[PDB]
Amino acid sequence: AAPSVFLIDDDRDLRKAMQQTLELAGFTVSSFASATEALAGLSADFAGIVISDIRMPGMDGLALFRKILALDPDLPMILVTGHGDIPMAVQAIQDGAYDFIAKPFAADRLVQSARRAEKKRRLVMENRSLRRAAEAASEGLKLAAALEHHH
Amino acid sequence: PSVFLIDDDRDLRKAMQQTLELAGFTVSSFASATEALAGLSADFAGIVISDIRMPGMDGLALFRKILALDPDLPMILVTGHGDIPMAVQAIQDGAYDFIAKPFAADRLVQSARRAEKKRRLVMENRSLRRAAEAASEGLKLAA
Ligand code: BF4
Ligand code: BEF
Numbered sequence: 001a002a003p004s005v006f007l008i009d010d011d012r013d014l015r016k017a018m019q020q021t022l023e024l025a026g027f028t029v030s031s032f033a034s035a036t037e038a039l040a041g042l043s044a045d046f047a048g049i050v051i052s053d054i055r056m057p058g059m060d061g062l063a064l065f066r067k068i069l070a071l072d073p074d075l076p077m078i079l080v081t082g083h084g085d086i087p088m089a090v091q092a093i094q095d096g097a098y099d100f101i102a103k104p105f106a107a108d109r110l111v112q113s114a115r116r117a118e119k120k121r122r123l124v125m126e127n128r129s130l131r132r133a134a135e136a137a138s139e140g141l142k143l144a145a146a147l148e149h150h151h
Numbered sequence: 152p153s154v155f156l157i158d159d160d161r162d163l164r165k166a167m168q169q170t171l172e173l174a175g176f177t178v179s180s181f182a183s184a185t186e187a188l189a190g191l192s193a194d195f196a197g198i199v200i201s202d203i204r205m206p207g208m209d210g211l212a213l214f215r216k217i218l219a220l221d222p223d224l225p226m227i228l229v230t231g232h233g234d235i236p237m238a239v240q241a242i243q244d245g246a247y248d249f250i251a252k253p254f255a256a257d258r259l260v261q262s263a264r265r266a267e268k269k270r271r272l273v274m275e276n277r278s279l280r281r282a283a284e285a286a287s288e289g290l291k292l293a294a
């Protein structure tokens with residue numbers, strides 16, 4: 001499976017330039033004009049990472065970040081904005097954002113950061129998959145189903 | 152409540168020192184990062200608050216020296232010449248805080264008191280274990 005990304009920015013042209021950059025870097029990139037749209041495809045099972053702009057109509061990037069945090073704190077999120085400042089960046093990192101990048105930005109900073117974030121996301125997902133695979137026995141023995149009500 | 156405060160801006164350094172003293176800290180202030188560093192140790196019970204752009208060694212270089220000295224000695228960076236990538240990296244590298252000038256007094260003070268409490272808890276645990284011969288496991292050496 002190729003590394004994947006959900007990319008969000010209301011600036012359509014920059015969105016496409018960023019998608020083009022990331023696919024050059026090896027990612028499979030789904031893009032969206034808004035955070036709410038992207039959320040329709042996000043869940044704790046998401047194999048990739050989220051790269052999102054901040055200032056958008058409706059739900060802004062910081063609000064999306066909180067929703068991702070609540071959905072799965074192990075799902076990496078990188079914020080990119082032309083409207084941030086020192087204090088916002090510090091707070092976002094402390095809140096757990098994977099990276100906080102200012103526009104205009106070097107494509108290599110974005111790429112290297114996405115690359116590492118996705119590798120990290122993959123390690124988490126492969127371990128979750130192994131854990132589930134190891135549960136196959138109990139489920140097939142019907143042990144899981146019979147013990148179900150004990151949770 | 153102890154603090155080493157470093158800034159080449161004399162008026163600001165004096166004002167930060169009064170503000171920190173008002174908050175209850177005993178402050179040792181310096182214009183030079185290396186003079187400040189020379190009076191530090193891994194036994195220092197306080198925190199370090201340093202400016203970034205300065206003659207001689209800069210605050211980021213001083214921070215890297217403190218990390219190697221004792222990664223549990225909190226460093227708060229304050230600067231009027233920072234940007235987003237520099238602040239992000241400082242926090243990711245372990246800086247306790249990164250504050251842009253101009254800052255509100257209460258922002259500097261709250262960050263200092265929390266950092267100091269964090270350091271105080273670290274030193275107490277270190278003190279308590281050395282006091283207790285019985286807390287030691289592993290290799291012993293005997294005559
Ligand atoms: F002028 Be000073 F900063 F050396 F005190
Ligand atoms: F609108 Be984004 F924050 F650049």
Ligand code: BEF
Binds near residue numbers: 134135136138
């Ligand atoms: F896979 Be264990 F038996 F829950």
Ligand code: BEF
Binds near residue numbers: 231232
């Ligand atoms: F000169 Be300091 F970095 F404000």
Ligand SMILES: [Mg+2]
Binds near residue numbers: 009011055
């Ligand atoms: Mg925008």
Ligand SMILES: [Mg+2]
Binds near residue numbers: 205
């Ligand atoms: Mg200075």
